Amino acid sequence: IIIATKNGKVRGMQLTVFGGTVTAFLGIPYAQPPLGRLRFKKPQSLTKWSDIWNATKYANSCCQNIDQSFPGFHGSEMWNPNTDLSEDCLYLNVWIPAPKPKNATVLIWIYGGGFQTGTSSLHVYDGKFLARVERVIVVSMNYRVGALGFLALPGNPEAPGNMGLFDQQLALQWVQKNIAAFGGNPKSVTLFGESAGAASVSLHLLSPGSHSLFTRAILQSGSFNAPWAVTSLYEARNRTLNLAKLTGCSRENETEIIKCLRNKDPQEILLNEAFVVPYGTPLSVNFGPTVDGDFLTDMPDILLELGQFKKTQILVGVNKDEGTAFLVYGAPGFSKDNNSIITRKEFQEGLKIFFPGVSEFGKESILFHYTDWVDDQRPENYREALGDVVGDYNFICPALEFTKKFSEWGNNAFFYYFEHRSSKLPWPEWMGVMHGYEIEFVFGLPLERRDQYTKAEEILSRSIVKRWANFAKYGNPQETQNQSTSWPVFKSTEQKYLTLNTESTRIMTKLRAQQCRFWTSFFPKV
Numbered sequence: 001i002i003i004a005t006k007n008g009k010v011r012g013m014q015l016t017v018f019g020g021t022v023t024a025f026l027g028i029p030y031a032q033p034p035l036g037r038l039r040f041k042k043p044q045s046l047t048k049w050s051d052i053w054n055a056t057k058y059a060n061s062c063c064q065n066i067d068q069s070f071p072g073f074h075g076s077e078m079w080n081p082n083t084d085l086s087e088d089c090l091y092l093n094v095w096i097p098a099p100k101p102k103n104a105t106v107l108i109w110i111y112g113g114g115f116q117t118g119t120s121s122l123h124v125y126d127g128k129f130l131a132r133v134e135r136v137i138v139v140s141m142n143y144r145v146g147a148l149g150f151l152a153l154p155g156n157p158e159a160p161g162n163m164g165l166f167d168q169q170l171a172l173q174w175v176q177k178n179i180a181a182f183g184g185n186p187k188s189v190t191l192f193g194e195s196a197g198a199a200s201v202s203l204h205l206l207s208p209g210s211h212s213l214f215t216r217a218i219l220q221s222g223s224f225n226a227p228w229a230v231t232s233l234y235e236a237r238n239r240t241l242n243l244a245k246l247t248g249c250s251r252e253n254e255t256e257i258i259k260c261l262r263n264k265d266p267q268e269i270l271l272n273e274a275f276v277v278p279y280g281t282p283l284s285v286n287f288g289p290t291v292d293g294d295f296l297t298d299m300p301d302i303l304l305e306l307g308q309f310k311k312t313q314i315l316v317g318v319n320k321d322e323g324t325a326f327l328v329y330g331a332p333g334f335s336k337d338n339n340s341i342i343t344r345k346e347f348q349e350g351l352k353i354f355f356p357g358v359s360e361f362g363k364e365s366i367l368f369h370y371t372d373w374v375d376d377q378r379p380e381n382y383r384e385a386l387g388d389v390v391g392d393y394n395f396i397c398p399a400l401e402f403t404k405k406f407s408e409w410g411n412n413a414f415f416y417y418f419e420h421r422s423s424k425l426p427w428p429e430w431m432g433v434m435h436g437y438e439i440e441f442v443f444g445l446p447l448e449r450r451d452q453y454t455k456a457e458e459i460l461s462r463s464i465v466k467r468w469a470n471f472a473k474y475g476n477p478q479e480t481q482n483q484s485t486s487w488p489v490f491k492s493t494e495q496k497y498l499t500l501n502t503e504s505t506r507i508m509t510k511l512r513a514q515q516c517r518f519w520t521s522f523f524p525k526v
Ligand SMILES: *[C@@H]1O[C@H](CO[C@@H]2O[C@@H](C)[C@@H](O)[C@@H](O)[C@@H]2O)[C@@H](O[C@@H]2O[C@H](CO)[C@@H](O)[C@H](O)[C@H]2NC(C)=O)[C@H](O)[C@H]1NC(C)=O
Pocket: 102, 103, 185, 187, 188, 189, 215, 472, 473
């Protein structure tokens, strides 16, 4: 029940899972609380304790704005924090199999939420099923988001940028120094994450300070080359100065600006985050990763292109309808409570919401590439086109381009296309296989027979859980026993990928080839 770590003793709790037992340590601190003079700085190392730390409940979630667009709707609210918000939020969780394993592979989860939201305590990130079923150890951590996690004045240690990424890194360090005491193998650590969590994972593959802290990496619906994932040196500064003006903290000594922002309540910083950009989108990452000269040494597109990253296996993938979820947070004519049949004029209006600073010619060129109908009378034509536009530009094409470029330097890569709509999904049917709704299958929630999922979904989750676990243990995401479809490596020539669904697993080639040539090779010139 009690494990001695390098900083002190922690006490866990016993969980009953599938007629078996998992030991959970919820809320182990891994850094000095970033409070007071520590706000905005890199995370500081934690001093020893002599008592027994009780890690039996999830800790505080990091300060963040909350989705209030659909009060009382489980579809949006399941992503809102489920513990108190506090700047005192640098804690992590460990699920170990019972009985204590001897040398278990470790899976470290990094949540998404656009670098502005998210928390490790969410129900769909419960690691107890992976521990029970595959005998891996699951670790997840809270990291700072929003301006408190990524405010940037490059070079200035009072606010150097990328603090949230350094939080994640200090947690990976904790796993290296401490996980053997829990039965884990620090030499067999697989990072996995979704959305901004996946972008984070892709940046740890790029940061030299993370290279000895993990073995392999899994990227679900995200990567650093997505247009939302990296704030520019220019933008970050305009945004830092705009936040200072909004809080009455405009000063000339840049350090006295930070000092002034350190006497503001967290609530005042959160209220003004939305407005630092003149035109935002539903996908807007107001404060995100930057080229800080510490975590990130050069612009990441250049490092990817020139082979400057950790050489290892990656598992990458995306969902069939990445884009649809964002259409009901601003696009005109849309609603989760009707079928959202939009006109051509509403389509064009929607491009202005999602591409606010793009030229007229650029928006016409999107319209031209996505409105060459196979049938011009289908009334859902424009509704589906805008979802595909948003998903292809923001997620699917950047992930495919990351996988091609990474694989060109000789490592095995595996690419999946998730296309199952959860039978319990509370969003309407027109949004399809939504952004974020593979996560519960990865974490094995359908394996609980009590949870109203179908048995076909139990089989799909069971197979995904095995493939993920085999990837982390052996570099190879196969299911070798139940006559499953073999997952081939993704090579830059043939570009084979595997489809994940309840009907038939299939091998296909060159996903969204025609679409991604537009986004990756033409649209960057506009
Ligand atoms: C626990 O296992 C490690 C080996 O981990 C494996 O090898 C990694 C390279 C990676 O592929 C993981 O996914 C694997 O599971 C043992 O490491 C050995 O330690 C001895 C120390 O005497 C060293 O001489 C060997 O070179 C190491 N082997 C490798 C392959 O690096 C470790 O000893 C095991 N510890 C316990 C307590 O079981």
